[PDB]
Amino acid sequence: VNPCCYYPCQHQGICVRFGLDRYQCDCTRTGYSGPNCTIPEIWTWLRTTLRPSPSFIHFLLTHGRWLWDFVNATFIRDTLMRLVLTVRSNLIPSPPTYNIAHDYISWESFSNVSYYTRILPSVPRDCPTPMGTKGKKQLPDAEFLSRRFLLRRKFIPDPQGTNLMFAFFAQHFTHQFFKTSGKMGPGFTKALGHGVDLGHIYGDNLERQYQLRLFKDGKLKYQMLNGEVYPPSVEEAPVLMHYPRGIPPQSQMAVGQEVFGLLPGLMLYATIWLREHNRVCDLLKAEHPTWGDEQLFQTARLILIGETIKIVIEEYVQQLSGYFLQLKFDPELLFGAQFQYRNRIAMEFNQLYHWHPLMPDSFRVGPQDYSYEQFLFNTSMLVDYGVEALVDAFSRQPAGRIGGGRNIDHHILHVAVDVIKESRVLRLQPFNEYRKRFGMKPYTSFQELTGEKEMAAELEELYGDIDALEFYPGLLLEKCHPNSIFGESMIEMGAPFSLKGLLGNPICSPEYWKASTFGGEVGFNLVKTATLKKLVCLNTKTCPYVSFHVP
């Protein structure tokens, strides 16, 4: 058997095969010694024997509002903010390591950017069972596995008060770096850029960008309907979009992210950001009459990227976490750190961000309550209701709890079925392994994972071994934190992939984080001040209730 199937190398050690039956673990810089990287170094031993559980930490970060308010008011905020940023980032390797093609470092993996990278090499195709050594020879039927534990029976809403506005933002946002190539196969993304390049607004390639560009004042092509700014028509900006056959070009909006047409929530956020872009263009021109299109454009995109990273950290992440510590976006907290300003989208991170449970049962827009079949490809809802209205509604409708189990509306349950299958094609390792890898203890039983005895029992009879429980199912079924949108792992594995892909963006480097980069103080501040409310209300006739938190 492939010795490496036993996953012999602990603490990030590398399993190198030798002979036709041997193996050697590479524990370089692992902080452990031994044949399997286990004998720790004294310091490593301390460092670990003292790390308070993720649970304890979470507890502290969500209690003592009073004590926290003081902290937030002192320099300690910055200190903890810097701690989080670094300590969270070291879990993510840079330059990247493997890909679906090479379960070893290789120049090709490092340079061919069409591949989604991965943290842990696949379960070798020559192992006994599919998950390696443990588990059954046949994995649970995805479909079944889904209808049994992921299928929403009764809508459990998210306790944190997360609404639809957040769900759509998340969806919209994540679709700038998760863009799997259907023609290429799993493990291949079209989102070269591998981060927040704001490419769902400008298109993922020059041609497409040029198509959407106005080529005057740094502006972005657009159109007026009911005397309001909405993205241009596919007729005006003839760019490839995904709309069902039969819908005319004169009824389709050209945007950048081909898929964004199949859901008002998306086209909504796509309208706000466009409006915002053209707006920043006007400011820049005032300040720089001498500037040309390209420069104004290029500058505007840089200002928006700043805005995005800001709102994502201080509001979006602040909400998802539920922490009392006021998170902060200040690229300078890292100027002391040893941090590589570079990111690469991991296949693991894509799965782990398949938050479909957020979608409600029905979509209510005022007294009117629309069905999935009325929402899903509705080409009118946006122009009909308009930005302000839709925002107010989405800002009021609460989304579902992400973790916990059985809360994915049947209209999209298929997606999760697919995610499971795809994970298998990718040959992702077992949940329990990832647990370890991202700094956690592996679960000892199914009843430990879920906080109960019922599901735990079935999962046990289905999988056979907890060390066989897969990634996504383990992620979604693991018991939720007290009053949280998800549980320990979703955050403890996702946070790193998240903050790295945020601070790792080049505009966060000391080279780019200069005011000149954004056209001067005006551009810079725009970034330093960005807020979900300003984003909306400065591009809308009236300012609605706008928030990520349900009122």
Ligand X SMILES: *[C@@H]1O[C@H](CO)[C@@H](O)[C@H](O)[C@H]1NC(C)=O
Ligand Y SMILES: CCCCCCCCO[C@@H]1O[C@H](CO)[C@@H](O)[C@H](O)[C@H]1O
Ligand Z SMILES: *[C@@H]1O[C@H](CO)[C@@H](O[C@@H]2O[C@H](CO)[C@@H](O)[C@H](O)[C@H]2NC(C)=O)[C@H](O)[C@H]1NC(C)=O
Sites of contact with ligand Y (CB under 6 A): 51, 54, 57, 60-61, 80, 83-84, 87-88, 91, 439, 492
Q: How far is the CB of 498 from ligand ISF (least distance, A)?
A: 4
Return the number of other C-beta atoms located less than 10 Å from residue 332's C-beta: 11
- The site for ligand Z (CB under 6 A) is made up of 112, 114, 184-185, 206-207, 210
Size, binding site for a copy of itself by CB under 8 A: 56
HSE-up of 239 (CA within 13 Å, CB side)? 27
Q: Residue 189: what are its φ and ψ, rounded to 5°? A: -115, 155
Residues 108-147 that bind a copy of itself (CB under 8 A): 108, 110-112
Choose the catalytic residue: 7, 353, 385, 472.
353
Alpha-carbon distance of 251 to 236, in angstroms, equals 11
C-beta of 385 vs 394, nearer to ligand HEM: 394
Cα–Cα nearest to 304, from 329, 334, 278: 278
Is 167 a binder of ligand HEM (CB under 6 A)?
A: yes
HSE-up of 390 (CA within 13 Å, CB side)? 24
Q: How far is the CB of 360 from ligand X (least distance, A)?
A: 16
Give residue number: closest CB to ligand X.
374
- The site for ligand ISF (CB under 6 A) is made up of 84, 88, 317, 320-321, 327, 352-353, 490-491, 494-495, 498-499
Annotated catalytic residue 175: yes
510 Cβ contact partners less than 8 Å away, ≥ 6 residues apart: 331, 335
Long-range CB contact pairs, 519-526, < 8 A, 24+: 519/284, 519/287, 519/288, 519/299, 519/303, 520/287, 522/283, 522/284, 522/287, 523/280, 523/283, 523/284, 523/299, 523/302, 523/303, 524/306, 526/280, 526/283, 526/303, 526/306, 526/307
**Of 39-47, 159-167, 228-236, 292-300, which part binds a copy of itself (CB under 8 A)?**
292-300
Choose the catalytic residue: 102, 175, 411, 549.
175
Contact 40, 30 (CB under 8 A): no
DSSP 306-332: HHHHHHIIIIIIHHHH--SS-----GG
From the centroid of its chain, how far is CA 478?
19
Q: How far is the CB of 374 from ligand X (least distance, A)?
A: 3
461 Cβ contact partners less than 8 Å away, ≥ 6 residues apart: none
Residue 114 interaction partner, one of ligand Z, ligand Y, ligand X, none, beta carbon < 5-8 Å per kind:
ligand Z
Annotated catalytic residue 353: yes
C-beta of 74 vs 226, nearer to ligand Y: 74
Is 283 a binder of ligand HEM (CB under 6 A)?
A: no
Alpha-carbon distance of 495 to 91, in angstroms, equals 10
Q: How far is the CB of 289 from ligand ISF (least distance, A)?
A: 40
Q: How far is the CB of 6 from ligand X (least distance, A)?
A: 5
Is 29 a binder of a copy of itself (CB under 8 A)?
A: yes
Is 170 a binder of ligand HEM (CB under 6 A)?
A: yes
Residue 29 interaction partner, one of a copy of itself, ligand HEM, ligand ISF, none, beta carbon < 5-8 Å per kind:
a copy of itself
Tell me which residues touch ligand HEM (CB under 6 A): 167, 170-171, 174, 178-180, 263, 350, 353-356, 358-359, 412, 414-415, 418
Catalytically active residues, by annotation:
175, 353
Tell me which residues touch a copy of itself (CB under 8 A): 14, 16-20, 24, 26, 28-29, 93-95, 97, 101-102, 104-108, 110-112, 193, 197-198, 206, 287-291, 294-295, 298-299, 301-302, 305, 337-338, 340-342, 506, 509-512, 514-517, 519-520
